[PDB]
Amino acid sequence: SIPLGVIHNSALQVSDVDKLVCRDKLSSTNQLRSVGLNLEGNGVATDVPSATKRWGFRSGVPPKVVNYEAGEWAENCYNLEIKKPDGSECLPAAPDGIRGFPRCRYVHKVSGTGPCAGDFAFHKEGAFFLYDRLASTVIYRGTTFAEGVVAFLILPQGYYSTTIRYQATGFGTNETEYLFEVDNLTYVQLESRFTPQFLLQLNETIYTSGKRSNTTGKLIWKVNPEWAFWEXXXXXX
Amino acid sequence: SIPLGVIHNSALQVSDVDKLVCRDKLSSTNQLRSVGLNLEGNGVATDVPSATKRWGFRSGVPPKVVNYEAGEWAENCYNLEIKKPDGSECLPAAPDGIRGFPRCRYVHKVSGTGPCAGDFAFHKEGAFFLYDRLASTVIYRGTTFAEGVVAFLILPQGYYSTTIRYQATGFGTNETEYLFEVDNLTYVQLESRFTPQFLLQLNETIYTSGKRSNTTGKLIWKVNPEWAFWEXXXXXX
Amino acid sequence: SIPLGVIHNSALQVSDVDKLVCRDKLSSTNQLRSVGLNLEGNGVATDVPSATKRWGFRSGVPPKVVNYEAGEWAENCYNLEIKKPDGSECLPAAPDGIRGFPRCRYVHKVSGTGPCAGDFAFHKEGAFFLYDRLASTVIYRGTTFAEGVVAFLILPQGYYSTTIRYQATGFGTNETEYLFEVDNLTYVQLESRFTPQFLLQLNETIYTSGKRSNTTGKLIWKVNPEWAFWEXXXXXX
Amino acid sequence: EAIVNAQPKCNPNLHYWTTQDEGAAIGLAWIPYFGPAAEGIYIEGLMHNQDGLICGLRQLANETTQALQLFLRATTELRTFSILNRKAIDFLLQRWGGTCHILGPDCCIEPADWTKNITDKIDQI
Amino acid sequence: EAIVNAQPKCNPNLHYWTTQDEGAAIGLAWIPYFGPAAEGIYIEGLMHNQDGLICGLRQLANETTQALQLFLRATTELRTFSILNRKAIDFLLQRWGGTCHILGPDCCIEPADWTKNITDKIDQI
Amino acid sequence: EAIVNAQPKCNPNLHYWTTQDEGAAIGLAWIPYFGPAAEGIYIEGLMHNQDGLICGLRQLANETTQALQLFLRATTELRTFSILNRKAIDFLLQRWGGTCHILGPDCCIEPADWTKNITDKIDQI
Ligand SMILES: *[C@@H]1O[C@H](CO)[C@@H](O[C@@H]2O[C@H](CO)[C@@H](O[C@@H]3O[C@H](CO[C@H]4O[C@H](CO)[C@@H](O)[C@H](O)[C@@H]4O)[C@@H](O)[C@H](O)[C@@H]3O)[C@H](O)[C@H]2NC(C)=O)[C@H](O)[C@H]1NC(C)=O
Ligand SMILES: *[C@@H]1O[C@H](CO)[C@@H](O[C@@H]2O[C@H](CO)[C@@H](O[C@@H]3O[C@H](CO[C@H]4O[C@H](CO)[C@@H](O)[C@H](O)[C@@H]4O)[C@@H](O)[C@H](O)[C@@H]3O)[C@H](O)[C@H]2NC(C)=O)[C@H](O)[C@H]1NC(C)=O
Ligand SMILES: *[C@@H]1O[C@H](CO)[C@@H](O[C@@H]2O[C@H](CO)[C@@H](O[C@@H]3O[C@H](CO[C@H]4O[C@H](CO)[C@@H](O)[C@H](O)[C@@H]4O)[C@@H](O)[C@H](O)[C@@H]3O)[C@H](O)[C@H]2NC(C)=O)[C@H](O)[C@H]1NC(C)=O
Ligand SMILES: NC[C@H]1CC[C@H](NC(=O)[C@@H]2[C@@H]3C[C@@H]4C[C@H]2C[C@@](c2ccccc2)(C4)C3)CC1
Ligand SMILES: NC[C@H]1CC[C@H](NC(=O)[C@@H]2[C@@H]3C[C@@H]4C[C@H]2C[C@@](c2ccccc2)(C4)C3)CC1
Ligand SMILES: NC[C@H]1CC[C@H](NC(=O)[C@@H]2[C@@H]3C[C@@H]4C[C@H]2C[C@@](c2ccccc2)(C4)C3)CC1
């Protein structure tokens, strides 16, 4: 029942479990490979507001983990530190041997609070959370992941990362509010249309034009100024 | 050495490891199955006094777990909360991923004390404690199990549960005393001949005829009034 | 890539992965065996000063464990309790199911301190730490191990142990100092040339000639008096 | 070897529970977030004692325990999931772990249809 | 069955990361004490969409999820590492799990070169 | 490839310990509750250096370490128990993972006895 990909006639196809192809040759277990593909590569929105709406909390379902051997360099990964309003953790510590996804251009680190109405956080579309060669059905605290799915195949016989920090309230609900963090006291209201590159230029021009908070209080700026990646309030304008 | 069951001549048999039967066909791993069968189904006594005498404590032997894929609906399962007289736990918390046996007509929940003279509780006849598709050599705290044994086979090509609570002293010894609990202050001296159905009728007639304790003290009643299931003291009469 | 040993022409050899030998017969998984061989058997020095210089601390590398089925009776094993000068442990507790190496003529138990400049202690030559049928890349606290390496093979179709206690300072560095412990207050400066048998005779003659400490203070003695095993200071002379 | 139920009793009917990995779920019930809790993943069935298979199976599980217990004593693995896969491997090794000598008792190659092939070609020639 | 990429987009290039177990390391870099940290065990590569294999693979992983999710729901194993080995076993059982009837469609034994052998011996005789 | 013991010394005798899963225990000693503690599950044996196998084996384990270490670096599995089973699978795939061309070097099918069968039938006809 788990589909196995095989190449026939210059085309990848699913192997027919009911039809024996004696021409197919499997000469060692090395020819079998498991691959994790990123949801990114299918065109899903990757901004934090859009991505988090794909995740939700559920009780009663034991988490499950499956390994995979090769993965895809991600443009967007995520790393969550979510607590309830009373300060208890919403996500479990990463189990022994589960490390973060190894290749992320941008790590979106989200801290904040939500009601977290369930024991584990699952992908509402059935996808996996991809970590270091281990795909999980649930999200682990403080551990970088990419959203993805796993394929199984029979083959024929530098790295820069940047962390983008955000604060959240009402995480995991309809009315989630997100702030992009410039420093511990300067924030920008986050909109879905803001790209990672835009947030990094927004950060740099705030630092250089001195629009950071020079008080002890919290300064929050507002801003109002179809293409995939591979192809004290105020205002600014 | 582990026997494998196979059907020849309209009869289940153990496969001869020394004799090759080329007629036998194994076309996928799906034809192989592991099954857990309940000791119940062989005619063993299932009342709490008789069942607990089959279990005992032992040190020096590491616990072991093996999985099984299909199980049998049980009439009787057990769930143990045993402490030493000094309040330390006798049984280990269930390991991650070990859940209770999924189909039990009656769960006999036993709380109480014993000397617990060993690190783990084993089956004195060599049987297993069957949990959710995992069979263990030992008993886990507060986790419903059925007594059973595992078979391995090559195939040819609603649900109601009721918890019955008991208190125990001297658990795991010759002189174990058991009480059936009607409420936190009303108990019945337990005899081996009392069936689950009898205990549930005994409970209901005590509740309705007002023979529960109407004091702060502990009321204990005594009672003196070959067929398998598939086919302040006082007195009452 | 993992070599497999096979017997051809009255000689053990590595199986050629590129050459099929149809004459080779594998009739069950029982013919496959994994064996742990002790570094001892290759002639490595086994005194505590020489052995410990082969181990070192490293961060960033996840530990790994592989099982093996048969092992070799060891003359020398080791058991380490090392702390930092501030009393924090240097080695992790043995994981569940990892027990000490089962056959050791002499267990060298070493307690003491070092800077422990890394998360785990590895074998600097790439060998394994052999425990009870589990070989690990790292050292576990208070758990007897032998240094060894693992082979994989396709086969053709009483016990006395003695613990020797030592104290260490500067463990895991160039300038490590070792004392052999006679009792909690009598020690001997340890030299590399001292054999286990010599240490046990040294201990017995100290006990019988009354050269143990009869004060509350710490008495330390000094001593100045090519063959493999299978073939308050002072002075003594 | 034959299986002789030597138990004091035998429940001749097997009311069983298991899982169905094949699933082929309705709509979105395969998504963990939406699917059943741990209590609701089970199917059920009832098997009667045709050919004495249920009492045979009870006896077989009983008789399996010793060898299974000795196996678990000797493994350092905490939870063993590989018994059935190893039996599948041993099934293959028993038949294909050596050279297959055609017509030999330990070689499951049937040359019948091809013997009749060569035979008809010889009748022609 | 054929694979029809039904995604809103397809990144036609696969910049991938993996490990190399073969290693054949330089000097002492295979020794854990001396070798790379967890971050430095990865190799990389780039594959383009020749024969439409990258978009096919994205679709295949998408379509695999349901069956894979149903499998993980039914296993009690916390971390599953055995899927590819079990597929290798099932590859062998499909071909060799029964008697191999030569010339039959389910038997991958090619007797061609030996048919020509027997044939030339018959031409002689 | 041949195995050349390059160690400074070789203990030519192997006093070994292992377990016996086969057991076939006396009376009730297979029951975990009654059987041996962890310290008493071991058997022992002594093997001498006939055919140089002990020194060969010491060298083989030494030479295995690099490839084994590189394998453990690349697996995310904490405890690896599957190496021997995977080698058994690869043993079968090397011989049976493709069509078996009879008389070909990569096909372990021996047709000798059946060649003499067809031959005697031809002598008759
Ligand atoms: C495998 O690939 C499939 C196709 O890309 C993925 O299908 C997605 O399935 C989810 C349900 O699990 C759908 O979510 C629903 O969306 C509607 C909103 O309408 C949306 O529909 C269009 C498509 O016509 C979509 O492109 C727009 O963004 C719309 O917003 C909600 O009302 C539902 O409540 C639910 O959220 C996705 O719409 C659907 N995507 C597509 C492109 O069809 C499938 O999830 C993939 N499987 C895995 C495991 O990743
Ligand atoms: C597989 O099936 C076997 C047969 O059903 C099970 O055999 C049981 O083995 C235990 C020992 O492990 C015996 O327990 C002993 O019993 C005597 C008491 O005498 C009893 O003997 C009769 C049988 O003639 C039995 O039916 C009565 O209830 C008697 O009370 C004690 O003195 C011993 O100390 C020890 O407790 C069982 O008697 C025996 N049962 C039967 C029916 O023979 C075996 O346990 C099964 N294996 C597993 C793993 O479940
Ligand atoms: C497999 O067997 C090999 C041969 O027995 C082992 O080789 C050992 O490899 C380590 C490096 O990992 C060497 O350690 C170096 O030693 C020098 C000191 O010089 C020593 O060289 C002679 C050999 O000519 C040796 O016998 C003396 O004791 C000398 O002291 C240092 O400068 C280096 O920093 C490093 O420590 C060993 O010397 C070498 N041994 C031998 C006998 O060649 C190999 O480790 C084995 N593999 C495993 C996994 O155990
Ligand atoms: N994929 C859905 C199905 C997958 C296979 C499932 N069969 C089992 O577990 C099997 C079948 C049903 C039940 C439990 C096991 C063993 C069994 C049996 C009993 C006596 C002799 C021989 C066999 C009895 C056959 C039923 C659901
Ligand atoms: N031992 C070194 C090598 C070991 C094999 C490694 N290949 C993979 O992971 C493979 C190859 C590279 C990459 C990831 C997987 C699947 C893949 C592919 C894509 C589309 C159709 C079919 C296949 C794409 C082939 C590359 C490094
Ligand atoms: N079931 C009881 C028995 C099961 C098999 C056990 N053999 C081993 O472990 C084997 C045999 C005994 C010992 C340890 C391993 C490898 C060995 C060897 C050495 C050199 C070359 C080739 C092989 C040496 C053969 C002995 C007990």
Ligand SMILES: *[C@@H]1O[C@H](CO)[C@@H](O)[C@H](O)[C@H]1NC(C)=O
């Ligand atoms: C969330 O959505 C709207 C606000 O956007 C609200 O009216 C509704 O009640 C909420 N629904 C749930 C399920 O929380």
Ligand SMILES: *[C@@H]1O[C@H](CO)[C@@H](O)[C@H](O)[C@H]1NC(C)=O
């Ligand atoms: C910002 O706050 C976090 C925790 O609240 C702290 O770890 C970090 O050092 C702070 N940064 C600065 C520049 O003070």
Ligand SMILES: *[C@@H]1O[C@H](CO)[C@@H](O)[C@H](O)[C@H]1NC(C)=O
């Ligand atoms: C924002 O700009 C400052 C100033 O150069 C820099 O130090 C900081 O790292 C930037 N933040 C991010 C997330 O790039």
Ligand SMILES: *[C@@H]1O[C@H](CO)[C@@H](O)[C@H](O)[C@H]1NC(C)=O
């Ligand atoms: C102080 O902060 C204000 C905003 O409150 C910012 O506009 C300004 O640049 C800062 N001061 C200077 C001198 O830049």
Ligand SMILES: *[C@@H]1O[C@H](CO)[C@@H](O)[C@H](O)[C@H]1NC(C)=O
């Ligand atoms: C338990 O059995 C009797 C009481 O029933 C008692 O005399 C005996 O000493 C006890 N035996 C053990 C082993 O505890």
Ligand SMILES: *[C@@H]1O[C@H](CO)[C@@H](O)[C@H](O)[C@H]1NC(C)=O
């Ligand atoms: C009975 O006591 C237990 C604990 O002693 C408690 O959990 C339970 O609520 C009590 N029941 C009633 C009716 O008081």
Ligand SMILES: *[C@@H]1O[C@H](CO)[C@@H](O)[C@H](O)[C@H]1NC(C)=O
């Ligand atoms: C005993 O009877 C009372 C009264 O109906 C009921 O509430 C209670 O659950 C019963 N106990 C059991 C164990 O059935």
Ligand SMILES: *[C@@H]1O[C@H](CO)[C@@H](O)[C@H](O)[C@H]1NC(C)=O
């Ligand atoms: C009060 O408890 C007594 C036993 O002490 C019981 O027999 C009686 O039914 C209870 N009272 C009433 C009025 O029922």
Ligand SMILES: *[C@@H]1O[C@H](CO)[C@@H](O)[C@H](O)[C@H]1NC(C)=O
């Ligand atoms: C250790 O070796 C010598 C002392 O024996 C010392 O001079 C040197 O600096 C030390 N080296 C290291 C790497 O600690």
Ligand SMILES: *[C@@H]1O[C@H](CO)[C@@H](O)[C@H](O)[C@H]1NC(C)=O
């Ligand atoms: C020596 O000291 C250790 C701990 O410091 C202690 O466990 C042991 O009992 C002592 N031995 C004696 C003879 O006092």
Ligand SMILES: *[C@@H]1O[C@H](CO)[C@@H](O)[C@H](O)[C@H]1NC(C)=O
């Ligand atoms: C040292 O000698 C004493 C006296 O016989 C003995 O009790 C002690 O165990 C010995 N220590 C060792 C390590 O053998």
Ligand SMILES: *[C@@H]1O[C@H](CO)[C@@H](O)[C@H](O)[C@H]1NC(C)=O
């Ligand atoms: C007391 O200890 C001394 C060393 O300080 C030792 O030489 C002597 O044997 C001990 N006393 C006696 C009477 O033996």
